[PDB]
Scaffold this active site. Structure first.
Site, PDB file in Angstrom:
ATOM      1  N   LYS A 161      21.035  -9.244  -9.091  1.00  0.00           N
ATOM      2  CA  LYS A 161      21.837  -8.406  -9.607  1.00  0.00           C
ATOM      3  C   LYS A 161      21.980  -7.471  -8.854  1.00  0.00           C
ATOM      4  CE  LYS A 161      17.201  -6.740 -10.678  1.00  0.00           C
ATOM      5  NZ  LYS A 161      15.884  -6.344 -11.635  1.00  0.00           N
ATOM      6  N   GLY A 201      21.824  -7.580 -17.847  1.00  0.00           N
ATOM      7  CA  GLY A 201      21.689  -8.654 -18.471  1.00  0.00           C
ATOM      8  C   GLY A 201      22.612  -9.169 -19.468  1.00  0.00           C
ATOM      9  N   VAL A 260      10.235 -14.948 -11.424  1.00  0.00           N
ATOM     10  CA  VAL A 260       8.804 -14.942 -12.266  1.00  0.00           C
ATOM     11  C   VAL A 260       8.723 -15.709 -13.389  1.00  0.00           C
ATOM     12  CG1 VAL A 260       7.009 -13.238 -12.735  1.00  0.00           C
ATOM     13  CG2 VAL A 260       8.534 -12.750 -10.894  1.00  0.00           C
ATOM     14  N   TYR A 288      45.231  24.636   9.194  1.00  0.00           N
ATOM     15  CA  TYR A 288      45.879  23.532   8.553  1.00  0.00           C
ATOM     16  C   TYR A 288      47.208  23.863   8.001  1.00  0.00           C
ATOM     17  CZ  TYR A 288      41.777  20.469   8.421  1.00  0.00           C
ATOM     18  OH  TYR A 288      40.865  19.469   9.024  1.00  0.00           O
ATOM     19  N   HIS A 336      24.647  24.680 -11.154  1.00  0.00           N
ATOM     20  CA  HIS A 336      23.039  24.775 -11.505  1.00  0.00           C
ATOM     21  C   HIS A 336      22.356  23.509 -11.615  1.00  0.00           C
ATOM     22  CE1 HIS A 336      24.940  28.635 -13.409  1.00  0.00           C
ATOM     23  NE2 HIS A 336      24.690  28.871 -12.245  1.00  0.00           N
ATOM     24  N   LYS A 390      28.490  27.549 -33.985  1.00  0.00           N
ATOM     25  CA  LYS A 390      29.572  28.000 -35.029  1.00  0.00           C
ATOM     26  C   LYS A 390      29.205  27.798 -36.243  1.00  0.00           C
ATOM     27  CE  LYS A 390      33.545  25.584 -35.619  1.00  0.00           C
ATOM     28  NZ  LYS A 390      34.477  24.852 -35.532  1.00  0.00           N
ATOM     29  N   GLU A 391      28.550  26.384 -36.465  1.00  0.00           N
ATOM     30  CA  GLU A 391      28.186  26.112 -37.934  1.00  0.00           C
ATOM     31  C   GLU A 391      26.731  26.892 -38.325  1.00  0.00           C
ATOM     32  OE1 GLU A 391      28.976  21.362 -37.404  1.00  0.00           O
ATOM     33  OE2 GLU A 391      27.289  22.091 -36.673  1.00  0.00           O
ATOM     34  N   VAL A 448      26.943  31.690 -35.616  1.00  0.00           N
ATOM     35  CA  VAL A 448      27.194  32.530 -34.271  1.00  0.00           C
ATOM     36  C   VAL A 448      28.698  32.637 -34.138  1.00  0.00           C
ATOM     37  CG1 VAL A 448      26.610  32.315 -31.826  1.00  0.00           C
ATOM     38  CG2 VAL A 448      24.845  31.455 -33.392  1.00  0.00           C
ATOM     39  N   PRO A 455      33.897  31.604 -29.538  1.00  0.00           N
ATOM     40  CA  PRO A 455      35.626  31.785 -29.301  1.00  0.00           C
ATOM     41  C   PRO A 455      35.971  30.224 -29.257  1.00  0.00           C
ATOM     42  CG  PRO A 455      34.189  32.351 -27.389  1.00  0.00           C
ATOM     43  CD  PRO A 455      33.261  31.805 -28.137  1.00  0.00           C
TER      44      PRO A 455
HETATM   45  N1  LIG Z   1      12.615 -11.871 -10.780  1.00  0.00           N
HETATM   46  C1  LIG Z   1      12.799 -12.098 -12.121  1.00  0.00           C
HETATM   47  N2  LIG Z   1      12.217 -13.162 -12.654  1.00  0.00           N
HETATM   48  C2  LIG Z   1      12.138 -13.447 -14.039  1.00  0.00           C
HETATM   49  N3  LIG Z   1      12.687 -12.829 -14.807  1.00  0.00           N
HETATM   50  C3  LIG Z   1      13.250 -11.771 -14.233  1.00  0.00           C
HETATM   51  C4  LIG Z   1      13.538 -11.581 -12.950  1.00  0.00           C
HETATM   52  N4  LIG Z   1      14.294 -10.168 -12.777  1.00  0.00           N
HETATM   53  C5  LIG Z   1      14.692  -9.855 -14.098  1.00  0.00           C
HETATM   54  N5  LIG Z   1      14.380 -10.787 -14.946  1.00  0.00           N
HETATM   55  C6  LIG Z   1      14.762 -10.973 -16.313  1.00  0.00           C
HETATM   56  O1  LIG Z   1      16.309 -10.673 -16.297  1.00  0.00           O
HETATM   57  C7  LIG Z   1      15.933  -9.426 -17.444  1.00  0.00           C
HETATM   58  C8  LIG Z   1      17.228  -8.477 -17.129  1.00  0.00           C
HETATM   59  O2  LIG Z   1      17.310  -7.920 -15.997  1.00  0.00           O
HETATM   60  P1  LIG Z   1      16.844  -6.348 -15.736  1.00  0.00           P
HETATM   61  O3  LIG Z   1      15.881  -6.382 -14.491  1.00  0.00           O
HETATM   62  O4  LIG Z   1      15.673  -5.954 -17.151  1.00  0.00           O
HETATM   63  O5  LIG Z   1      18.181  -5.503 -15.866  1.00  0.00           O
HETATM   64  P2  LIG Z   1      18.858  -4.461 -16.857  1.00  0.00           P
HETATM   65  O6  LIG Z   1      17.643  -3.844 -17.545  1.00  0.00           O
HETATM   66  O7  LIG Z   1      19.886  -3.894 -16.451  1.00  0.00           O
HETATM   67  O8  LIG Z   1      19.514  -5.450 -18.155  1.00  0.00           O
HETATM   68  C9  LIG Z   1      14.796  -8.956 -17.418  1.00  0.00           C
HETATM   69  O9  LIG Z   1      14.441  -8.343 -18.831  1.00  0.00           O
HETATM   70  C10 LIG Z   1      13.948 -10.068 -17.090  1.00  0.00           C
HETATM   71  O10 LIG Z   1      13.689 -10.929 -18.413  1.00  0.00           O
END
Ligand SMILES: Nc1ncnc2c1ncn2[C@@H]1O[C@H](COP(=O)(O)OP(=O)(O)O)[C@@H](O)[C@H]1O
Ligand SMILES: CC(C)(COP(=O)(O)OP(=O)(O)OC[C@H]1O[C@@H](n2cnc3c(N)ncnc32)[C@H](O)[C@@H]1OP(=O)(O)O)[C@@H](O)C(=O)NCCC(=O)NCCS
Ligand SMILES: CC(C)(COP(=O)(O)OP(=O)(O)OC[C@H]1O[C@@H](n2cnc3c(N)ncnc32)[C@H](O)[C@@H]1OP(=O)(O)O)[C@@H](O)C(=O)NCCC(=O)NCCS
Ligand SMILES: CC(C)(COP(=O)(O)OP(=O)(O)OC[C@H]1O[C@@H](n2cnc3c(N)ncnc32)[C@H](O)[C@@H]1OP(=O)(O)O)[C@@H](O)C(=O)NCCC(=O)NCCS
Ligand SMILES: [Mg+2]
Ligand SMILES: [Mg+2]
Lengths: 1033, 249, 131
Positions: free
Chosen positions: A57, A66, A110, A363, A696, A716-717, A720, A723
């Site tokens: 990503k 996503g 994962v 310059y 700031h 304004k509403e 206050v 301007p």
């Molecule tokens: N390493 C990974 N293994 C499995 N699922 C993943 C992994 N990285 C991201 N995801 C899945 O991808 C989805 C979208 O990616 P995310 O990191 O949450 O990006 P965003 O919030 O910008 O949409 C996650 O909600 C999750 O379900």
């Protein structure tokens, strides 16, 4: 300000520093890919890339990836490469931002169920940090604020793990509560320790195997660099998606970071024809608002500011960056540079404008080539001179420059340039207020005293100063024309103890130590108001200051403020500037109008506006630019509501936060009844395509409600007086005021002239009104310049020309660039005169002295003081005697006989052991050099003839080293060709030759001092057997 | 002897070997034949310290003294006697400070913070006008020489790290000429290979560095004396309007 | 002024009040009208410290200097510059030492022993011949 960091940055820090019982999986398992990636090297460093499937990503501060098809899930390395092929390098449009996809993260896939996805978020607020949790995490969480369990960890509070389970994990699966509670606890400590202000993990995944941080979004308090540098390392703060990062921005950011002064630069459109170089976080936004109101949004090239009294050099480095940026490519209609600002409180307008002028000069060719027209508007310290140098550079370069001062409305130059127009406690201070000033700020103190005097106060408002680097002492100041003394203390406890009448402390401590000194001040019950000047105190620290101040009933004005002013009573430090501005804006007597602003510069513009439209300022406060001001707009508006003398209130609001809505609430509740005029600056932000952090720290809208447009509408509403734009602010103030006079709410007081203060000498000479004669006169060295000058020759040129010691002596003693042989001869003389043992008068005295346990200078001078007649005098004596004889026209034999008759011996003739057949080597060395290099040696020739005669009486009546140096030096002065005879004769007469001996022998004497010390020689006492005591009877 | 001997070296040999003023100072102060870069560096120090105008405590005193119709020696010494603490003392002070800090093993940041806590400013740091981006030319001349000719500069290296820290507070908290001479001289004594540590440390302690300033500035002071005499300048009396008389009653 | 003022006291008043050198020193050094015994004591100190022969570090240097044909000021200062540490410094040293010891609250015996342990000799104690 709070700055966003990349997902990679956040994860690296989390993995590095989080402390949990929870086993966090896939620690450091990420690979970054850019269009320049060496894939062979990437794979060598990240072999795990082949161990399982992956996720890819972009890491470019793009939200909802996503939902944009920007998350490639469960891919082989080959699949990742194929996924990147059409994306890496590609342009992308996410909302109103358009940029290139150039930075991606690859991580292990994962496997997990939707039930194993959780949401966690920590974010900062004035009152503490909120911790959010939801059991239904992921790309479809929706409104987390409404849905998620929320918990406030107070300003100095600790997050109770039992509270995590009780309040946050209510709906979490039972088997996961223990691990989630442990992780959240560690996450919170991590958030605090590394000065985060926002940390979101969506989704956080928990499987049978442990905890996985799948996504991370965060902001850190960039102002905490001085604290966290070690842990953060070389932390990078990316631009929002849609904006590019430029090296000119990084350069200015580095200048900003290395100083108390504020230097900000953001490029909006490098190709735009409208450039600004405005002073102040407030004014810069107002000028940007005006430009955008006049349809210049598409052509506005930059947003930036300089403030907090930058030096001439800082302003030069800033200006040259802008000038370089605006001369990159030509625009058909030429370009405009807007050099604007408020009437400054303490920034030196002459110094800053001299820096800009120097850049303009450097310059001028490119600026003329790019058809640049410059518009200037500025007030403040030494603005007269600042405007003069601007006007002058225009004349000399031929660049069109239109220069305006205090009499022109701040934003008028915009319309000109664009062709629209032709060219707690209710009362804080009283007339009795006494303050302690923390820091060595003599100028600010004198300004306060000048104000106190014209206000006809009975006593100075500054009772004492605290400065820990010096010892206790008194500092001289002026009360009218009278010189007075103000005590300075090393310790705050001494100042407080000695001045129980003080209830105010003005803290000029730098950002690094303002926290500790403010906390220290609050241990003194007498102190009821503290002004904190410093810009850049971490938000987390300011919250702790607020907590303590609130619990102690102490009003804090600031941080990041010039302070405020109560006409007729008290002035905080630099607020309102010098007498010329105090008098011009009638700040020496109160009117009926009270105001509150975030901006320092703009507060002084309000002093000007209010003085012209009404009976004047009653009280003004600048709350400062930070996210959490010590005292808020509402805090002061309520004081003004409860102050009978105040008949109307002016509020100069700003984009960022929701403070101004408290005014709407107070009016609706019937608490606020007095007329309120309000304008919120930052309307331009609504029109920009990416998020912009203004000058700031607090000026950044994190929600729709925080925008200036939204706040102005709501106010304004609520009733206050708002301007149309800042341009109409003066008009509306005058209208409200006139209605209040008409209704008899206000009865303008008849004007009384104020006490008269003398002009300081400094300004008087500068405007050439007075003339004072110099008591002194020098001609050998000038240290005042950009370079050290020795007799017209700059120090670099002295070295470049390989002048050497001899050459430097020619410059400083004679103000001549001597021939190289003459320089070398001088060095030669210093070498032969360096020492002659410990037995001679001077060396002996130096030694005695060093043995009497004295310092180098005392020991050296003790010996030098023997020089002159019987010791060391012979060089001068010989030179003078031979020169007289020679010039008289008497032949050497006549001279020898004349001296015998007169009963005088020849100076520079004779030696105890050296014969005519056994020469003095020092004489040989010099004689040989002189004969070989000097163009003519007439006096040496004469002296050698005298030696021929004397050595025929007694063989040891040789020309000795004093005679040889004496006559050779005369031959040098006379025949090197750098001196007129008159000049050569004058130098001998005034004792240049005595200088040679003294300077030369000083080396030997210092040598003896060092020797006695190293030889560990004890106190000397002369033996009685060597003393003849011939006393009376 | 039959010849003048400077620390075991006869005067002819001194000239034959082209020792120079730096070389002579090596023999008379340290009793060592220093490397030619070390000699040249000493000469360089004596040149940058030669003068700094007539406004400084010492120069002023010499001028007053010359104008009060006194001799060269009286006028010179009257000025030299101001050298020591708040005037010209900085070289020794800076060298001693940094040497202690370095040798203690504290890192530059620890040192910077230690000073702040102890309520002490760093000797050899700061300048009224010269910025980090607007350098003191005297510092440039020497810094560049040293970087080019000193084989090792550990203490200078340490000081430049401290400079890195201080200049990132306020840009004018640069390593000034007194700090630059101070640390470079220590690096010279320690790393030129002519001194044992003990020897190098003893020389700094007995104030060889004060000698450098005194010797160097003596040229400027004599310069001023001669200048006033030539300018035929009258007796000075300080104006009463510049004096606050706060006498008892 | 129309008259010379020493620490608030006019020169005529100084003479009229028979202040003496001690009294004048009281005004110029301390800006005080000291008791007459204090004035007299100061004068007494200036008398016992007047000289101590030509063998001492300072006297020797003045003599050398005078003999090298120099002026009074040069000769005098050449000698004065030896005053300070091992020569003439003992008065200050003794005063400071004893004042510290006294004010510390240590009894004389504790002080004597403290010095011995610290490996320091007592300033203002000892004489080459006087018993
Ligand atoms: N390493 C990974 N293994 C499995 N699922 C993943 C992994 N990285 C991201 N995801 C899945 O991808 C989805 C979208 O990616 P995310 O990191 O949450 O990006 P965003 O919030 O910008 O949409 C996650 O909600 C999750 O379900
Ligand atoms: C005569 C004698 C006693 C002393 O004389 P001397 O040491 O040679 O000479 P002086 O000390 O008088 O000095 C020599 C000259 O140099 C001159 N002079 C010395 N230093 C001088 C200087 N720096 N600049 C100029 N002139 C100088 C002196 O004025 C003197 O001049 P003069 O000869 O015209 O009078 C000695 O030469 C002697 O013993 N001779 C031997 C005689 C003998 O054998 N006797 C028989 C024993 S049986
Ligand atoms: C804060 C301020 C008032 C004074 O600070 P300053 O002049 O930069 O700094 P100081 O005079 O306190 O000195 C800076 C540091 O250098 C240190 N220092 C100075 N000379 C030194 C030396 N020779 N050796 C070592 N340290 C030295 C000081 O100890 C101080 O340390 P610290 O910052 O850790 O306390 C000033 O920077 C300022 O006006 N800033 C602008 C703030 C602003 O915009 N306010 C809002 C107005 S709306
Ligand atoms: C013991 C002896 C050898 C040397 O002792 P000395 O000269 O009297 O004394 P010292 O030189 O050790 O000084 C005496 C003390 O005065 C102290 N002292 C000296 N000057 C001092 C000063 N200005 N301030 C403070 N203390 C001072 C010393 O520290 C020493 O202290 P201590 O005794 O507590 O150690 C000597 O006394 C002696 O010869 N005794 C005769 C012994 C004998 O008969 N031997 C047998 C031959 S058969
Ligand atoms: Mg997500
Ligand atoms: Mg600012």
């Amino acid at each position: 300000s709070a700055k966003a960091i990349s997902e990679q940055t956040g994860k690296e820090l989390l993995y590095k520093f989080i402390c949990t019982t929870s086993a966090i999986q896939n620690r450091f398992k990420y690979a970054r890919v850019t269009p320049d990636t060496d894939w062979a090297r990437l794979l060598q460093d990240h072999p795990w890339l082949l161990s399982q499937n992956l996720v890819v990503k972009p890491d470019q501060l793009i939200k909802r990836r996503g939902k944009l098809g920007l998350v490639g899930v469960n891919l082989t390395l080959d699949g990742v490469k194929s996924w990147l092929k059409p994306r890496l390098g590609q342009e992308a449009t996410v909302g109103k931002a358009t940029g290139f996809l150039k930075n991606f993260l690859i991580e292990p896939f994962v496997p997990h169920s939707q039930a194993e996805e959780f949401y966690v978020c920590i974010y900062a607020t004035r009152e503490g940090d909120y911790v959010l949790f939801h059991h239904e995490g992921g790309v479809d969480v929706g409104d987390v604020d409404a849905k998620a369990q929320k918990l406030l960890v107070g300003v100095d509070e600790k997050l109770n793990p039992e509270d995590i389970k009780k309040h946050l994990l209510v709906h979490a699966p039972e088997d996961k509560k223990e691990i989630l509670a442990s992780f959240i606890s560690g996450l919170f400590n991590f958030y605090e320790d590394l000065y985060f202000t926002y940390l979101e993990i969506n989704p956080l995944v928990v499987t049978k195997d442990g905890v996985y941080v799948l996504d991370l979004a965060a902001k850190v308090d960039a102002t905490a660099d001085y604290i966290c540098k070690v842990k953060w390392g070389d932390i990078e703060f990316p631009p929002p998606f849609g904006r590019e990062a430029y090296p000119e921005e990084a350069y200015i950011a580095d200048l900003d970071a290395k100083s108390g002064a504020s230097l900000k630069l953001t490029l909006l459109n490098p190709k735009g024809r409208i450039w600004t170089m405005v002073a102040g976080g407030g004014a810069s936004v107002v000028y940007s608002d005006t430009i955008c109101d006049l349809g210049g949004v598409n052509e506005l090239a930059n947003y930036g500011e300089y403030s907090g009294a930058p030096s001439e050099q800082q302003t030069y480095d800033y200006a040259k960056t802008i000038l370089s940026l605006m001369t990159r490519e030509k625009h058909p209609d030429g370009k405009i540079l807007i050099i604007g600002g408020s009437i400054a409180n303490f920034t030196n307008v002459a110094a800053t404008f001299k820096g800009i002028v120097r850049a303009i000069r450097d310059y001028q060719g490119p600026l003329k080539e790019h058809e640049v027209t410059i518009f200037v508007r500025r007030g403040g310290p030494n603005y007269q001179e600042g405007l003069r140098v601007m006007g002058e550079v225009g004349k000399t370069t031929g660049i069109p420059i239109h220069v305006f001062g205090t009499e022109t409305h701040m934003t008028a130059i915009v319309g000109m340039a664009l062709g629209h127009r032709p060219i707690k406690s209710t009362t804080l201070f009283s007339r009795h207020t006494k303050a302690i000033v923390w820091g060595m700020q003599t100028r600010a103190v004198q300004g306060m005293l000048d104000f106190d005097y014209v206000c006809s106060r009975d006593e100075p408002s500054v009772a004492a100063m605290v400065y820990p680097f010096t010892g206790d002492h008194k500092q001289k100041f002026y009360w009218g024309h009278k010189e007075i003394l103000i005590p300075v203390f090393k310790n705050m406890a001494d100042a407080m103890r000695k001045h129980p009448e003080v209830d105010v402390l003005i803290n000029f401590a730098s950002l690094r130590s303002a926290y500790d000194s403010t906390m220290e001040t609050m241990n003194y019950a007498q102190i009821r108001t503290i002004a904190i000047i410093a810009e850049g105190i971490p938000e987390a620290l300011t919250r702790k200051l607020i907590k303590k101040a609130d619990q102690k009933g102490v009003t804090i004005i600031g941080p990041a403020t010039v302070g405020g002013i109560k006409p007729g009573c008290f002035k905080i430090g630099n607020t309102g500037g010098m007498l010329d501005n105090i008098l011009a804006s009638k700040l020496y007597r109160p009117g009926s109008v009270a105001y509150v602003s975030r901006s320092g510069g703009m507060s002084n513009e309000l002093n000007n506006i209010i003085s012209r439209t009404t009976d004047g300022v009653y009280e003004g406060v600048a709350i400062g630019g930070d996210r959490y001001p010590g005292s808020t707009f509402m805090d002061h508006v309520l004081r003004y509501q409860d102050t009978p003398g105040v008949k109307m209130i002016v509020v100069l609001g700003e984009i960022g936060g929701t403070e101004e809505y408290k005014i709407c609430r107070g009016i609706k509740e019937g608490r606020l009844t007095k007329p309120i005029v309000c304008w919120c600056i930052g309307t331009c932000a609504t029109m920009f395509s990416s998020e912009v952090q203004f000058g700031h720290a607090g000026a950044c809208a994190n929600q729709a409600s925080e925008t200036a447009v939204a706040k102005n509408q709501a106010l304004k509403e609520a009733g206050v007086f708002v301007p149309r734009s800042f341009d109409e602010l003066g008009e509306i103030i005058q209208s409200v005021y006139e209605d209040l006079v008409a209704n008899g709410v206000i009865v303008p007081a008849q004007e009384v002239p104020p006490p008269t203060v003398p002009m300081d000498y400094s300004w008087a000479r500068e405007l050439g009104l007075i003339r004072k004669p110099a008591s002194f006169m020098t001609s050998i060295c000038d240290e005042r310049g950009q370079e050290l000058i020795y007799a017209g020759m700059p120090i670099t040129e002295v070295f470049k020309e390989e002048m050497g010691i001899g050459g430097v002596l020619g410059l400083l003693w004679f103000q001549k660039r001597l021939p190289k042989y003459s320089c070398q001869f001088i060095e030669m003389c210093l070498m032969v005169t360096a020492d002659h043992g410990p037995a001679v008068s001077g060396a002996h005295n130096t030694i005695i002295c060093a043995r009497a346990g004295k310092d180098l200078v005392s020991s050296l001078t003790s010996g030098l003081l023997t020089i002159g007649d019987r010791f060391g005098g012979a060089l001068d004596a010989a030179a003078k005697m031979f020169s007289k004889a020679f010039d008289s026209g008497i032949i050497p034999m006549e001279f020898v006989n004349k001296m015998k008759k007169e009963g005088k011996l020849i100076m520079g003739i004779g030696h105890r052991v050296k014969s005519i057949n056994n020469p003095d080597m020092r004489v040989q060395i010099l004689k040989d050099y002189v004969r070989q290099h000097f163009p003519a040696t007439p006096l040496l020739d004469y002296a050698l003839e005298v030696e021929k005669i004397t050595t025929s009486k007694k063989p040891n009546l040789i020309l000795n080293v004093d005679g040889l140096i004496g006559v050779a030096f005369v031959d040098m002065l006379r025949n090197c060709g750098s001196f007129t005879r008159e000049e050569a004769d004058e130098y001998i007469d005034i004792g240049a030759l005595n200088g040679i001996f003294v300077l030369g022998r000083s080396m030997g004497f210092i040598g003896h001092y060092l020797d006695q010390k190293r030889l560990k020689q004890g106190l000397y006492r002369h033996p009685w057997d060597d003393i003849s005591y011939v006393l009376p009877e």
